[PDB]
Enzyme design. Structure first.
Site, PDB file in Angstrom:
ATOM      1  N   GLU A 171      18.123 -29.104  59.862  1.00 30.62           N
ATOM      2  CA  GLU A 171      19.537 -28.863  59.211  1.00 30.62           C
ATOM      3  C   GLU A 171      20.568 -29.952  60.161  1.00 30.62           C
ATOM      4  O   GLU A 171      20.414 -30.394  61.339  1.00 30.62           O
ATOM      5  CB  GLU A 171      19.885 -27.439  59.632  1.00 30.62           C
ATOM      6  CG  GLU A 171      18.562 -26.523  59.713  1.00 30.62           C
ATOM      7  CD  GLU A 171      18.954 -24.864  60.140  1.00 30.62           C
ATOM      8  OE1 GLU A 171      19.887 -24.873  60.872  1.00 30.62           O
ATOM      9  OE2 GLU A 171      18.338 -23.945  59.831  1.00 30.62           O
TER      10      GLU A 171
ATOM     11  N   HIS B 240      19.409 -30.802  63.880  1.00 30.27           N
ATOM     12  CA  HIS B 240      18.690 -30.312  64.758  1.00 30.27           C
ATOM     13  C   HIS B 240      17.532 -29.491  63.912  1.00 30.27           C
ATOM     14  O   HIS B 240      17.760 -29.175  62.866  1.00 30.27           O
ATOM     15  CB  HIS B 240      19.131 -29.152  65.360  1.00 30.27           C
ATOM     16  CG  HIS B 240      19.990 -28.181  64.916  1.00 30.27           C
ATOM     17  ND1 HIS B 240      21.310 -27.983  64.280  1.00 30.27           N
ATOM     18  CD2 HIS B 240      19.578 -26.782  64.267  1.00 30.27           C
ATOM     19  CE1 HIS B 240      21.504 -26.792  63.593  1.00 30.27           C
ATOM     20  NE2 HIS B 240      20.308 -26.140  63.562  1.00 30.27           N
TER      21      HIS B 240
ATOM     22  N   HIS C  11      14.561 -27.039  63.650  1.00 24.68           N
ATOM     23  CA  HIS C  11      14.032 -25.729  64.148  1.00 24.68           C
ATOM     24  C   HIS C  11      12.542 -25.505  64.281  1.00 24.68           C
ATOM     25  O   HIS C  11      11.942 -26.091  62.813  1.00 24.68           O
ATOM     26  CB  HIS C  11      14.535 -24.483  63.282  1.00 24.68           C
ATOM     27  CG  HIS C  11      15.828 -24.132  63.878  1.00 24.68           C
ATOM     28  ND1 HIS C  11      16.044 -23.360  64.924  1.00 24.68           N
ATOM     29  CD2 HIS C  11      17.101 -23.843  63.107  1.00 24.68           C
ATOM     30  CE1 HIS C  11      17.514 -22.961  65.233  1.00 24.68           C
ATOM     31  NE2 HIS C  11      18.179 -23.462  64.107  1.00 24.68           N
TER      32      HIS C  11
ATOM     33  N   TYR D 230      15.552 -15.568  59.619  1.00 27.00           N
ATOM     34  CA  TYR D 230      16.663 -16.437  59.739  1.00 27.00           C
ATOM     35  C   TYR D 230      16.398 -17.627  58.966  1.00 27.00           C
ATOM     36  O   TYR D 230      17.274 -18.241  58.290  1.00 27.00           O
ATOM     37  CB  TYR D 230      16.813 -16.753  61.193  1.00 27.00           C
ATOM     38  CG  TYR D 230      17.960 -17.744  61.509  1.00 27.00           C
ATOM     39  CD1 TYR D 230      18.953 -17.295  61.348  1.00 27.00           C
ATOM     40  CD2 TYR D 230      17.342 -18.890  62.256  1.00 27.00           C
ATOM     41  CE1 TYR D 230      20.111 -18.359  61.475  1.00 27.00           C
ATOM     42  CE2 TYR D 230      18.576 -19.880  62.426  1.00 27.00           C
ATOM     43  CZ  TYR D 230      19.848 -19.576  62.256  1.00 27.00           C
ATOM     44  OH  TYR D 230      20.642 -20.457  62.620  1.00 27.00           O
TER      45      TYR D 230
HETATM   46 MG   LIG Z   1      20.211 -23.806  63.106  1.00 27.47          MG
END
Ligand SMILES: [Mg+2]
EC number: 3.1.21.-
Length: 171
Positions: free
Chosen positions: A71, A80, A82, A138
């Site tokens: 993202e 970054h 994840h 998330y």
């Molecule tokens: Mg993030």
């Protein structure tokens, strides 16, 4: 049981791209996604390369389940990734070293300069072990282009992960 962590990729790394990174001939199924800008595509290429190298890796990374989501940084330049991963042979004592080796051999093929990525694991003030619920609560509830790209080998998500409409349904 899947671990959770983050790697930051500053925008300076994109400047060092060589011909193997830029002239990638990948197809990228964007049938249910937004048009991916050039650097968005560079990060999608990188993520597909890392998944490709991981699917046939040996050692502690063999037979592992992964879910990587790149993202844009919300308040700054850069991106970054994840990183959620877990598998036989994978423990808290080798997670960081394994992730850094995996991501850097792929990045090395695609860059002109000497770079190193730093892995930052989810941990209290003990490594986190809620990765499947981290994916569900998330990572999968983001809609492009907030999330730029995503790769996985987890059954169920293999397709439901690069589909903007499915991500838009949880919204
Ligand atoms: Mg993030």
């Amino acid at each position: 049981e899947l671990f959770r962590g983050v790697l930051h990729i500053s925008s300076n790394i994109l400047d060092c791209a060589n011909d193997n990174w830029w002239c990638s001939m990948l197809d990228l199924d964007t049938s249910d996604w937004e048009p991916l800008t050039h650097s968005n595509r560079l990060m999608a290429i990188y993520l597909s390369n890392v998944a490709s190298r991981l699917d046939f890796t040996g050692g502690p990374l063999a037979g592992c389940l992964y879910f990587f989501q790149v993202e844009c940084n919300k308040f700054e330049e850069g991106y970054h990734i994840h990183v959620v991963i877990g598998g036989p042979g994978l423990n808290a004592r080798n997670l960081t070293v394994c992730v850094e080796g995996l991501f850097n051999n792929v990045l090395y093929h695609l860059v002109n300069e000497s770079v190193k990525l730093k892995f930052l694991p989810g941990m209290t003030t003990k490594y986190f072990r809620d990765g499947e619920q981290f994916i569900e609560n998330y990572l999968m509830k983001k809609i492009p282009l907030n999330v730029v790209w995503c790769v996985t080998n987890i059954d169920g998500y293999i397709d439901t992960c690069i589909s903007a409409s499915f991500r838009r349904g949880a919204c």
